[PDB]
């Protein structure tokens, strides 16, 4: 109940919201129903318009004008952001050449400079060149502060959790708005876009930037918007609390746009009809800087203009229906669209059965437009499975593409041209980041980045300390000018033992074999040096990964290749080689085809044993550093050491084979040169985060073999690729991916078919970070090179994502 017969006299746009039932004059109120009855009146001034003429100016002050023209409108704070143009022969700020802004200027009393985030619903990459004749302003924003040529949201590519994101740090399934809608099983509550569930506070985890700012005395803006708040009044509003007295004055404002996502939805993302929307938020943005500049904050303020998602071309005919795969559609709730999540219409109903459902889902129809997914196997660059309000059944749809259950749904709810949702990396769902104002860099173009990381940043520009979030703290810091970041290494945890000879063949008793009983000073002295390490200078580039956990494990030095060996896991946490452009590839010759070494340095119960995999019927096993890659014949012995073998189910074997066998040299070939490190991940309760011993699901049958349920390499080289990876002065380039373990190939349609025509493909949909290893694996890479560290965290942070341009 709202009593709403209080008065906002002197409470227009309040930023303190006042408690039920005393009535509201604040932003929110009017999607509360809570404003007092002269909210519109005094609140909500139209007349006249939003801009001086003329014939207005030095006017005698009217208060119901929308804004003023008046001599005193500059000390009241409310000029129409054209005032000093119309009137006192100013020019536009979009007029105006840039100029460095160097140091803040700010008037006195201004503590620290104002950050304004400008956001802009829909906003794709791609409109920053293709719609720049019709956005001056913007195009001003971009080519004198800072800008990168786009910012990649995350998954689902939806506003709620992209919005949320950016005010966190933390991925969807952390903060929890892991979609435009959802249910949430224990609560046993719905989300939706429409409605009052989504103002519960109970659905929004981590802690956004204006609870942040808060918390440490930095006063916000608030930075929602009622929707029937014209833009012009949402700036005027800013502009205002910009000239509040000193104590009451907010360090941080949102602006937010409904468009051009609004438009996009009708019309596509390149309509014609899109232009106007365009021209119609750069029109905002000028109103902004004309009016900053009015109260000289233009070279005071930090502006960030910043989109949620894209848009992309989807049409209503372009709709897959489940009730062509499904017998059973009536026993499940679908989220449809752009993406899918199934889960039981009841859960009384104990016929309803997953594992039925995603198989008669999978590989259909010659050109199925969905995959669907297990959540857990979902590429884990997604991070989209750690939160309750996933569901167990996930569907990936193609770009242009909608799911929905029936046809029913589809023209029983072609209205729309355009949406969004799709995984994170296709081009068109990328969008836009823009930073001006004396914090940001001068005319300065930056690297593509991840949404995740602005939160940081944000926190940066207002002194502010972050919560913990998913952001790398310094990964952005060449895009500041000042308030870097400087963070220091973490500390290795556990360090390294270096075992030597300690163990005779006879101890062993794996149940393995190899045919290696052939019979030198010459060749003995060198085996003897590469086993202690004098080929380590040469794969180890970047010095040895730090373990950030306490474990026991060895340092294994060989001719090809160095390894950290896991006492506990019984195989390496990571495997290091370098292969030139020049190194030649062989096949694993006919005595050695099922040939396994007992490794002397390695005690019989830290080892494997064969007879394990003998036994298990499903598992099979394979080598981290390839066999193919041998420098000689006699240094591919040490790739047959049980020290050097994993667990590998024949189906994963024939993708791991390829890369290793083919794509790796590949990589050498046109790199010129590549240092490979690879290894196991165990994320058995999908947490994106490194499982310990306990939380392993499976083993090698009869064994503590335990099995992986992905496996990483991260590939680097030189950025010049003029020099070989392993004689480079300068930045680095890097590729990754964590391909899943699987017993099967299903996720890849054609895989019956040679592996040259879906393995390199598997393989760009499982691209990584060298970060995502990092937190699956609890180690810390690249810790030795000349290198900055913030360059190092950026490096770390990049994705290869395989799309065009
Ligand atoms: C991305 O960045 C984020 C932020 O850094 C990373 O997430 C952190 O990861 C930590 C490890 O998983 C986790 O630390 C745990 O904290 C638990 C207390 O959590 C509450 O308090 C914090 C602080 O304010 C709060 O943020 C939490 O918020 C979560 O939950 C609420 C309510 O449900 C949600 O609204 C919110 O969105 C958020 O949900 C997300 O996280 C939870 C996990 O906490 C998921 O379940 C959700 O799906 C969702 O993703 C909480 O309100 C604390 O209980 C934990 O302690 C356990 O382990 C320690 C070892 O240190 C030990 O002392 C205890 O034994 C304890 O175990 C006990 O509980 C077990 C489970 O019931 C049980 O098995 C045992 O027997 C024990 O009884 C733990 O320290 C931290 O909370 C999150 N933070 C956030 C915001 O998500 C994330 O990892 C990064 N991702 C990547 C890929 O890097
Ligand atoms: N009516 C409205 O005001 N909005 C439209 C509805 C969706 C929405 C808005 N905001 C607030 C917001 C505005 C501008 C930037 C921004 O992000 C930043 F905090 F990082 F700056 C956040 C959200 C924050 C979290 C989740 C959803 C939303 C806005
Ligand atoms: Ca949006
Ligand atoms: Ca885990
Ligand atoms: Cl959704
Ligand atoms: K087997
Ligand atoms: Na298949
Ligand atoms: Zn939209």
């Given at each position: 109940?709202?009593?709403?017969?209080?008065?906002?006299?002197?409470?227009?746009?309040?930023?303190?919201?006042?408690?039920?039932?005393?009535?509201?004059?604040?932003?929110?109120?009017?999607?509360?129903?809570?404003?007092?009855?002269?909210?519109?009146?005094?609140?909500?001034?139209?007349?006249?318009?939003?801009?001086?003429?003329?014939?207005?100016?030095?006017?005698?002050?009217?208060?119901?004008?929308?804004?003023?023209?008046?001599?005193?409108?500059?000390?009241?704070?409310?000029?129409?952001?054209?005032?000093?143009?119309?009137?006192?022969?100013?020019?536009?700020?979009?007029?105006?050449?840039?100029?460095?802004?160097?140091?803040?200027?700010?008037?006195?009393?201004?503590?620290?400079?104002?950050?304004?985030?400008?956001?802009?619903?829909?906003?794709?990459?791609?409109?920053?060149?293709?719609?720049?004749?019709?956005?001056?302003?913007?195009?001003?924003?971009?080519?004198?502060?800072?800008?990168?040529?786009?910012?990649?949201?995350?998954?689902?590519?939806?506003?709620?959790?992209?919005?949320?994101?950016?005010?966190?740090?933390?991925?969807?399934?952390?903060?929890?708005?892991?979609?435009?809608?959802?249910?949430?099983?224990?609560?046993?509550?719905?989300?939706?876009?429409?409605?009052?569930?989504?103002?519960?506070?109970?659905?929004?985890?981590?802690?956004?930037?204006?609870?942040?700012?808060?918390?440490?005395?930095?006063?916000?803006?608030?930075?929602?918007?009622?929707?029937?708040?014209?833009?012009?009044?949402?700036?005027?509003?800013?502009?205002?609390?910009?000239?509040?007295?000193?104590?009451?004055?907010?360090?941080?404002?949102?602006?937010?746009?409904?468009?051009?996502?609004?438009?996009?939805?009708?019309?596509?993302?390149?309509?014609?009809?899109?232009?106007?929307?365009?021209?119609?938020?750069?029109?905002?943005?000028?109103?902004?800087?004309?009016?900053?500049?009015?109260?000289?904050?233009?070279?005071?303020?930090?502006?960030?203009?910043?989109?949620?998602?894209?848009?992309?071309?989807?049409?209503?005919?372009?709709?897959?229906?489940?009730?062509?795969?499904?017998?059973?559609?009536?026993?499940?709730?679908?989220?449809?669209?752009?993406?899918?999540?199934?889960?039981?219409?009841?859960?009384?109903?104990?016929?309803?059965?997953?594992?039925?459902?995603?198989?008669?889902?999978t590989?259909?129809?010659?050109?199925?437009?969905?995959?669907?997914y297990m959540?857990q196997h979902l590429?884990?660059?997604?991070?989209?499975?750690?939160?309750?309000?996933?569901?167990?059944?996930?569907?990936?749809?193609?770009?242009?593409?909608?799911?929905?259950?029936?046809?029913?749904?589809?023209?029983?709810?072609?209205?729309?041209?355009?949406?969004?949702?799709?995984?994170?990396?296709?081009?068109?769902?990328?969008?836009?980041?823009?930073?001006?104002?004396?914090?940001?860099?001068?005319?300065?173009?930056?690297?593509?980045?991840?949404?995740?990381?602005?939160?940081?940043?944000?926190?940066?520009?207002?002194?502010?300390?972050?919560?913990?979030?998913?952001?790398?703290?310094?990964?952005?810091?060449?895009?500041?000018?000042?308030?870097?970041?400087?963070?220091?290494?973490?500390?290795?945890?556990?360090?390294?033992?270096?075992?030597?000879?300690?163990?005779?063949?006879?101890?062993?008793?794996?149940?393995?074999?190899?045919?290696?009983?052939?019979?030198?000073?010459?060749?003995?002295?060198?085996?003897?040096?590469?086993?202690?390490?004098?080929?380590?200078?040469?794969?180890?580039?970047?010095?040895?990964?730090?373990?950030?956990?306490?474990?026991?494990?060895?340092?294994?030095?060989?001719?090809?290749?160095?390894?950290?060996?896991?006492?506990?896991?019984?195989?390496?946490?990571?495997?290091?080689?370098?292969?030139?452009?020049?190194?030649?590839?062989?096949?694993?010759?006919?005595?050695?085809?099922?040939?396994?070494?007992?490794?002397?340095?390695?005690?019989?119960?830290?080892?494997?044993?064969?007879?394990?995999?003998?036994?298990?019927?499903q598992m099979?096993?394979?080598?981290?550093?390839?066999?193919?890659?041998?420098?000689?014949?006699?240094?591919?012995?040490?790739?047959?050491?049980?020290?050097?073998?994993?667990?590998m189910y024949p189906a994963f074997k024939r993708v791991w084979?390829?890369?290793?066998?083919?794509?790796?040299?590949?990589?050498?070939?046109?790199?010129?040169?590549?240092?490979?490190?690879?290894?196991?991940?165990?994320?058995?309760?999908?947490?994106?985060?490194?499982?310990?011993?306990?939380?392993?699901?499976q083993?090698?049958?009869?064994?503590?073999?335990?099995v992986p349920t992905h496996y990483?390499?991260?590939?680097?080289?030189?950025?010049?690729?003029?020099?070989?990876?392993?004689?480079?002065?300068?930045?680095?380039?890097?590729?990754?991916?964590i391909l899943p373990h699987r017993p099967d190939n299903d996720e890849s349609?054609?895989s019956?078919?040679?592996?040259?025509?879906?393995?390199?493909?598997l393989?760009?949909?499982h691209?990584?970070?060298?970060?995502?290893?990092?937190?699956?694996?609890?180690?810390?890479?690249?810790?030795?090179?000349?290198?900055?560290?913030?360059?190092?965290?950026?490096?770390?942070?990049?994705?290869?994502?395989?799309?065009?341009?």
């Amino acid at each position: 109940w709202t009593a709403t017969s209080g008065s906002c006299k002197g409470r227009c746009f309040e930023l303190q919201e006042v408690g039920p039932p005393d009535c509201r004059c604040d932003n929110l109120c009017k999607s509360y129903s809570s404003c007092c009855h002269d909210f519109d009146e005094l609140c909500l001034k139209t007349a006249r318009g939003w801009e001086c003429t003329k014939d207005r100016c030095g006017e005698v002050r009217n208060e119901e004008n929308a804004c003023h023209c008046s001599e005193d409108c500059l000390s009241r704070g409310d000029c129409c952001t054209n005032y000093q143009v119309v009137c006192k022969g100013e020019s536009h700020w979009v007029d105006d050449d840039c100029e460095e802004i160097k140091v803040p200027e700010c008037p006195a009393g201004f503590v620290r400079p104002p950050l304004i985030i400008f956001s802009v619903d829909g906003f794709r990459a791609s409109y920053m060149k293709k719609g720049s004749k019709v956005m001056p302003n913007i195009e001003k924003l971009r080519s004198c502060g800072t800008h990168a040529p786009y910012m990649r949201p995350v998954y689902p590519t939806k506003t709620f959790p992209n919005l949320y994101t950016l005010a966190t740090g933390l991925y969807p399934e952390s903060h929890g708005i892991v979609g435009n809608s959802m249910y949430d099983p224990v609560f046993d509550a719905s989300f939706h876009l429409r409605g009052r569930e989504k103002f519960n506070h109970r659905w929004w985890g981590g802690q956004p930037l204006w609870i942040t700012a808060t918390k440490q005395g930095v006063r916000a803006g608030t930075f929602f918007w009622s929707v029937s708040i014209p833009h012009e009044r949402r700036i005027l509003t800013i502009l205002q609390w910009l000239s509040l007295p000193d104590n009451e004055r907010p360090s941080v404002y949102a602006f937010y746009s409904e468009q051009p996502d609004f438009s996009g939805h009708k019309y596509g993302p390149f309509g014609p009809e899109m232009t106007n929307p365009l021209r119609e938020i750069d029109k905002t943005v000028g109103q902004l800087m004309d009016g900053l500049k009015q109260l000289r904050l233009h070279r005071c303020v930090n502006v960030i203009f910043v989109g949620d998602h894209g848009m992309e071309d989807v049409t209503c005919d372009r709709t897959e229906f489940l009730s062509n795969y499904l017998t059973n559609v009536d026993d499940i709730t679908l989220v449809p669209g752009t993406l899918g999540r199934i889960r039981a219409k009841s859960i009384n109903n104990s016929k309803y059965d997953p594992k039925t459902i995603i198989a008669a889902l999978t590989c259909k129809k010659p050109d199925q437009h969905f995959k669907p997914y297990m959540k857990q196997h979902l590429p884990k660059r997604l991070h989209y499975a750690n939160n309750r309000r996933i569901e167990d059944i996930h569907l990936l749809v193609d770009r242009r593409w909608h799911v929905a259950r029936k046809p029913l749904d589809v023209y029983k709810k072609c209205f729309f041209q355009g949406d969004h949702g799709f995984d994170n990396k296709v081009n068109s769902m990328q969008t836009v980041f823009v930073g001006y104002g004396p914090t940001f860099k001068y005319r300065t173009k930056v690297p593509p980045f991840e949404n995740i990381e602005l939160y940081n940043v944000m926190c940066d520009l207002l002194g502010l300390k972050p919560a913990p979030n998913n952001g790398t703290h310094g990964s952005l810091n060449h895009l500041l000018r000042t308030n870097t970041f400087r963070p220091t290494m973490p500390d290795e945890v556990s360090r390294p033992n270096y075992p030597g000879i300690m163990y005779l063949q006879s101890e062993f008793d794996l149940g393995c074999t190899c045919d290696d009983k052939v019979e030198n000073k010459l060749e003995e002295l060198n085996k003897r040096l590469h086993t202690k390490g004098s080929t380590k200078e040469r794969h180890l580039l970047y010095g040895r990964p730090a373990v950030l956990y306490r474990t026991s494990y060895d340092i294994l030095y060989h001719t090809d290749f160095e390894s950290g060996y896991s006492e506990i896991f019984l195989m390496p946490l990571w495997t290091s080689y370098t292969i030139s452009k020049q190194a030649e590839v062989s096949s694993i010759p006919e005595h050695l085809t099922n040939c396994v070494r007992p490794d002397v340095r390695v005690s019989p119960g830290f080892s494997q044993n064969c007879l394990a995999y003998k036994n298990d019927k499903q598992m099979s096993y394979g080598f981290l550093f390839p066999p193919y890659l041998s420098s000689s014949p006699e240094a591919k012995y040490d790739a047959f050491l049980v020290t050097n073998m994993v667990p590998m189910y024949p189906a994963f074997k024939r993708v791991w084979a390829y890369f290793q066998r083919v794509l790796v040299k590949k990589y050498a070939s046109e790199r010129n040169g590549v240092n490979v490190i690879s290894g196991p991940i165990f994320d058995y309760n999908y947490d994106g985060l490194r499982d310990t011993e306990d939380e392993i699901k499976q083993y090698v049958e009869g064994s503590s073999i335990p099995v992986p349920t992905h496996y990483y390499s991260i590939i680097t080289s030189c950025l010049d690729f003029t020099q070989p990876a392993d004689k480079c002065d300068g930045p680095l380039s890097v590729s990754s991916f964590i391909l899943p373990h699987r017993p099967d190939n299903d996720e890849s349609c054609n895989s019956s078919e040679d592996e040259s025509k879906w393995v390199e493909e598997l393989m760009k949909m499982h691209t990584a970070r060298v970060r995502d290893i990092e937190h699956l694996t609890g180690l810390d890479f690249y810790r030795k090179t000349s290198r900055s560290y913030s360059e190092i965290l950026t490096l770390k942070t990049y994705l290869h994502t395989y799309e065009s341009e």
